[PDB]
């Protein structure tokens with residue numbers, strides 16, 4: 001009668017410290033190769049993209065602990081560790097590499113949610129105005145109350161036929177109303193609003209955009225402890 | 232029971248010798264991206280535009296030019312549609328992927344569509360005239376000597392992005408002493424990918440550059456896209 005939770009884990013799936021998942025099994029698109037990671041329990045699929053700069057986007061799993069190095073070469077969470085353990089997910093989500101989670105048994109399980117935090121990459125960009133790009137900077141500067149700055153992660157749920165259920169937002173940073181919030185801990189992102197989703201896509205948006213409306217803030221985030229619930 | 236729906240852009244253009252154009256796209260790198268809905272809201276078609284006008288995906292046109300070479304002509308080599316005056320022209324590549332989305336996949340499956348060559352491709356294949364001027368990008372006309380061919384591939388996907396399958400149609404074929412260049416409307420059956428939420432298109436040929444990129448124009452024409460009630 002009481003409905004069981006299943007926590008997705010990549011714990012003990014990396015054989016080396018300070019490492020990430022890599023594959024050469026993708027299919028080549030425009031820029032990147034595309035692959036689908038299945039978790040060890042075959043509960044979910046995660047989109048995975050790679051290319052000329054290493055990890056491209058979608059998701060990879062990592063145990064990296066680097067909380068100091070700016071720029072895209074660092075895939076670490078600002079926490080320096082997972083919520084449940086050593087191994088967590090890093091994502092880059094955009095029109096080239098859309099980050100997608102697919103439920104492999106949607107008739108049996110619903111989505112509950114996941115723990116979320118910032119990448120070190122995003123944290124240092126927002127806090128210090130240091131995106132690591134060097135002499136050239138792509139970002140406008142650090143986030144401020146002056147500009148009412150914010151960074152939003154949006155999860156959109158879909159049915160198996162492609163019908164949109166809904167969107168739900170999580171603020172990774174927020175300088176509205178004299179707050180100075182930059183997420184640097186694991187925080188629960190509840191997905192009960194899209195629990196019936198066959199798949200979930202991720203989009204990011206901020207107050208730091210170019211003249212073509214494209215976000216300058218890195219479109220990266222971290223997840224851990226993705227939780228499903230028996231229906 | 233088993234009733235078909237034919238998608239039509241007939242009488243959606245108010246001028247002769249015209250094409251669909253919009254400024255409602257979202258800017259990418261090279262091209263703006265837009266989604267055309269048909270008048271019945273049965274399908275979406277990807278549509279791209281940029282500095283040379285029509286970029287790729289699809290547009291609808293009633294143009295009848297069967298003589299002018301090069302990319303400025305979007306006409307079918309037929310000079311008309313299968314069902315009427317208005318048909319689809321496509322350019323499909325990694326910049327502008329041509330996609331048809333089924334807007335009610337729980338109710339309808341895909342059946343197929345009529346296909347032909349663009350004037351652009353026909354004159355390139357038949358005459359070795361791509362219209363690029365003093366510069367020619369193509370190798371020459373298609374020949375039996377080189378066993379030449381041009382293939383259009385339709386790939387079917389579920390809404391989650393899982394590949395169902397691929398189906399090929401040969402727009403030209405010089406293998407094994409054939410001398411086929413498609414210059415009429417021909418049925419391209421999609422029963423192999425009928426359950427697709429969306430279909431993408433890719434083209435390939437025997438005329439490639441040193442980087443393996445197709446020189447033959449990656450253009451084609453469609454008409455009478457057909458869905459069937461499940």
Ligand code: CNC
Pocket residue numbers: 031051053054055056057071072092094096125131132133138139210214215216217218219220260
């Ligand atoms: C188009 C694009 C863009 N990209 Co790239 C993405 N997605 N990118 C690309 C592509 C460029 C080529 C193509 N096929 O068009 C593509 C997919 C290959 C690419 C690659 C990368 N990109 C990457 C990232 C993270 C970023 N990219 C953006 C610049 C991000 C852009 C968004 C933005 N807000 O700026 C972006 C959408 C638009 C750039 C543009 O055309 N500007 C206008 C143009 C006129 O100016 P430009 O100065 O001549 O543009 C050049 C640079 O932008 C350069 N470039 C592109 N991305 C980067 C990233 C870095 C760190 C550097 C140093 C240069 C680049 O390529 C452009 C042409 O040469 C970015 C702001 C997007 C975001 N996440 O918000 C971001 C950097 C964040 C930051 N503040 O540090 C990659 C690390 C992604 C990956 N593979 O993991 C990687 C690194 C490339 C590198 N050179 O070191």
Ligand code: CNC
Pocket residue numbers: 261281283284285286287301302322324326355361362363368369439440444445446447448449450
């Ligand atoms: C990259 C590329 C290519 N393109 Co353009 C595409 N998609 N293209 C582009 C981009 C160029 C970006 C840039 N750097 O300036 C991009 C997206 C802007 C572009 C644009 C177009 N392209 C177009 C087409 C149809 C073509 N392109 C190809 C040349 C097609 C290429 C495929 C191929 N098989 O050649 C291609 C994939 C590779 C070119 C390359 O890097 N290598 C060649 C390099 C070493 O030599 P290059 O001589 O210096 O290359 C230049 C030309 O290729 C030029 N260029 C690119 N496209 C064309 C088209 C024409 C008609 C002319 C005269 C020049 C060009 O840009 C390059 C750099 O300056 C093409 C063979 C692809 C195909 N199979 O359909 C085809 C021409 C077919 C033919 N035999 O006539 C457009 C009409 C598409 C549209 N928008 O509807 C348009 C026209 C541009 C124009 N100048 O008049």
